[PDB]
Write a sequence for this structure.
């Protein structure tokens, strides 16, 4: 059908959701129909709803999820705290495949890092990304330690023949700092860096956001995702 | 030869140095000769000296450095910034081989986290552990996101057939919360949790530290490391 990208990250709180929303905006503005699948969502007591933040920030309406867990833990932990299983792997891949269609960028968002359990039994976002012939975008920080997490994540993909559509620095500080400029350049030798989102971007109104996302990415790479 | 252990971590700041000293201390108390080596050491310009810190807390005398750099950054960076070079793969491996004796436990403390470049080009503590046929002791946190990071690390050890010697939680809070509880239990399900050192164990004095260490590790596991 169309193009299916999983948006993973080297960890929690590296900015997967804001980057998701940002690539989603950029894609829309390039005239691409965007869907966003978020199979499992946790932290729903705190008020977390990444599907909502993407609809709010980038205007996506095709916004698909299966399970919502109140506790702010990895899925498995929050499902065990609820007394409730996790969606089956079948539900996720079938959901994502229904979602996919030609001319549609379907973004697939996981929870935490690449190898966290999403479905039972023991299924990760890496597995889901295999079952739907999806490539992976990797959201990374600029903090001390990010190259190792990146290489680990980049290796865990290659080990399953999951393509790496590249990195995004979820949060770019102002001003950078020695460690941030150094990592940004070192990340660049490791893989193609597609964008570095200015810090605090997740609090912008939908207009400001669409500007930042318009600029942050590269017009040609975006448009060439058809 | 004897037993070589690389001590690595899911990243930086997870307790590698103190775990090195704790295994080292407990091993000494088990009658085991111990050397420790820090092939790459950054942060010297702010007094970072992990060999010295291991000598302090555990009393190991046999300490071997090799590359030292001022800035508190990854070795590739601290070396570009001081105009200096990264040591060569075979110089690291040589520093370790010179320490390896039968009956000796040799600990090789890494520089933040398993895939960090220690030597040009892209030479990691993993490649070293292959060269010297070492097992890897993986230092972890109990914090959020530690599962993913630990699995990625083990997965990277297993892809080069570097045997995992188990995990150590470098700082273990008292009392632990729901998330610390869930991770320690979840962690124990993917690999052997050799220990969970108490928080701030780095501020214990010689006596307290050795008591902590001996308590933290299964004496039979420690003694089983070198025959
Ligand atoms: O989606 C996020 O990364 C932020 C979420 C919001 C609540 C806990 C975070 C989480 O999901 C998570 C945490 C630890 C390990 C795996 C995880 O998936
Ligand atoms: O070794 C540690 O983790 C603590 C040191 C203390 C100074 C920077 C840390 C460091 O070494 C480091 C950090 C990120 C990447 C590679 C690295 O080698
Ligand atoms: N470029 C970026 C990246 C991330 N963020 C912040 O990171 C949070 C995710 O834990 C988001 O909720 C958001 O607060 C941000 O503000 N700007």
């Amino acid at each position: 059908g169309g193009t299916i990208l999983v948006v993973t990250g080297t960890g929690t709180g590296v900015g997967k959701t804001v980057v998701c929303a940002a690539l989603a905006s950029a894609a829309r503005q390039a005239g691409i129909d965007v869907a966003v699948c978020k199979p499992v969502q946790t932290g729903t007591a705190r008020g977390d709803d990444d599907l909502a933040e993407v609809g709010r920030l980038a205007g996506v309406t095709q916004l698909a999820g299966l399970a919502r867990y109140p506790q702010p833990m990895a899925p498995a932990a929050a499902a065990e705290h609820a007394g409730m299983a996790l969606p089956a792997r079948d539900q996720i891949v079938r959901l994502i495949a229904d979602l996919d269609r030609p001319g549609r960028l379907t973004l697939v968002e996981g929870a935490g890092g690449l190898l966290v359990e999403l479905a039972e039994p023991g299924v990760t976002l890496r597995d889901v990304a295999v079952d739907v012939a999806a490539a992976a975008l990797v959201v990374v920080t600029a903090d001390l330690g990010t190259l190792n997490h990146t290489k680990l994540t980049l290796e865990a993909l290659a080990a399953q023949q999951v393509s790496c559509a590249g990195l995004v620095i979820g949060s770019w500080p102002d001003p950078p700092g020695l460690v941030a400029a150094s990592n940004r350049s070192a990340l660049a030798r490791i893989a193609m860096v597609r964008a570095a989102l200015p810090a605090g971007a997740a609090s912008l109104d939908a207009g400001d956001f669409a500007a930042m996302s318009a600029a942050a990415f590269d017009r040609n790479w975006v448009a060439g995702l058809v």
User: Anything to note?
Assistant: The interface with chain B takes residues 11-13, 71, 73-74, 76-77, 81, 112-116, 144-145, 147-149, 151-153, 155-156, 159, 178-179, 182, 186 of chain A (CB under 8 Å).
